[PDB]
């Protein structure tokens, strides 16, 4: 399981490793919402090193991999567990592409967006 | 159980049959490579003009929706290209770029098939 | 007469000219990307009235030939010293080509499609 | 340091032989014939198959690169099909598509001689 599931702490840069490491703590144990974050950092150009390791420390030869198979766990998420009911009419593809932009643009601009009230749409408790 | 076939027949229907021929003739022209056919079936999913081919196939291979399909294909074509079979073809360019440009070049092919040549774009990949 | 770097908006109601309108406005002090949101916003199908008034307005007898002179400039632009920098190997034709589909995603949905950290690299 | 002045003097690079001599014969018949003679240079230049006689082009030409090459090929190609002395041939087509599909037979017919009669194809723009 090259997934199989955290905490990296490792040559960290500026206040956007923090920003991102306070998000997937707050939204640890929700499983949609931590990849969406995490696809949102992988996404993110301003996190080359962090994603580098992530890469490496999942197995996977590339980011494109890497951020294929979160895509990937991200529609089998939304497969109608729950958030059938949350999906509605829009369709997963683009829900995820929200989702993930509207991340990468309050990690980019924290003062612009609320994204907790983005994000907790998506928590069922 | 397997999602992905490499020997399979594709249907026989209304497909508004002018780009659905555009389609199966390229598909065997390049059925004798595997990452170029494969090339061809991304672009016929991405392609919206091909609402019926493509929702045959969802079902017919299983998958849930037509985006988890489409992220199949293109996990196993970064795998042929990122992973080095290819990757000697595969220059400074990142394999996204490459396969999105390929797609984006079949499926303006498809809308017009006069205004580009898409077969010697796809015989570059040897073979 | 030749194109060289006055142009609002449209007349009928497409909210996607609003979209590269801004855009425009934004990346006004790069030369490079200006060029690549026109030659996009020219090869965009879902502009053919703005596209076919700046075809008469830069005086072009036709639309391919003024999408050829914005792909002339952008070549050379990547041929300059701080671009050609930027460049890595990477072919002209193919850069271009793919900003030119990357922005029409963020045209057609901006909901999503990072476009402005897209465009950044391409900030000195 | 001109740009696309018609004349003569090419090469020919190296290697291709037989791709080259079918080349060479398209643009000896048709040199009299600019817009016939562009066609086929732009065919020679889209060609994947021509790597060293395109390269010698398009330094000899003085150009930065292949695709400013063709990309000169091309401006040349619509100005002169569309304004001056070829909208009468070219009726109500479209210029690109027109190109391109002559470029196409020309490739088509480099890379297969013997399924495509281009002569047909090229001499409807003589006799003005
Ligand atoms: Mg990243
Ligand atoms: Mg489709
Ligand atoms: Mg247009
Ligand atoms: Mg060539
Ligand atoms: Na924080
Ligand atoms: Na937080
Ligand atoms: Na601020
Ligand atoms: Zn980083
Ligand atoms: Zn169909
Ligand atoms: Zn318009
Ligand atoms: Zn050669």
Request: aromatic share 8%; glycine share 4%; no cysteine.
């Amino acid at each position: 399981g090259f997934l199989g599931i955290f905490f990296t702490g490792a040559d960290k840069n500026i206040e956007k490793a923090t920003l991102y490491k306070n998000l997937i703590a707050k939204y640890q144990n929700n499983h949609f919402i931590s990849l969406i974050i995490l696809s949102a950092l992988v996404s993110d150009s301003k996190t080359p090193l962090m994603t580098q390791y992530l890469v490496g420390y999942l197995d996977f030869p590339s980011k494109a991999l890497l951020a294929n198979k979160i895509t990937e766990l991200l529609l089998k998420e939304l497969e109608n567990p729950d958030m059938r009911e949350i999906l509605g009419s829009r369709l997963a593809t683009d829900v995820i592409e929200e989702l993930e932009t509207k991340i990468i643009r309050y990690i980019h601009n924290p003062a612009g967006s609320d994204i907790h009230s983005t994000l907790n749409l998506w928590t069922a408790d």
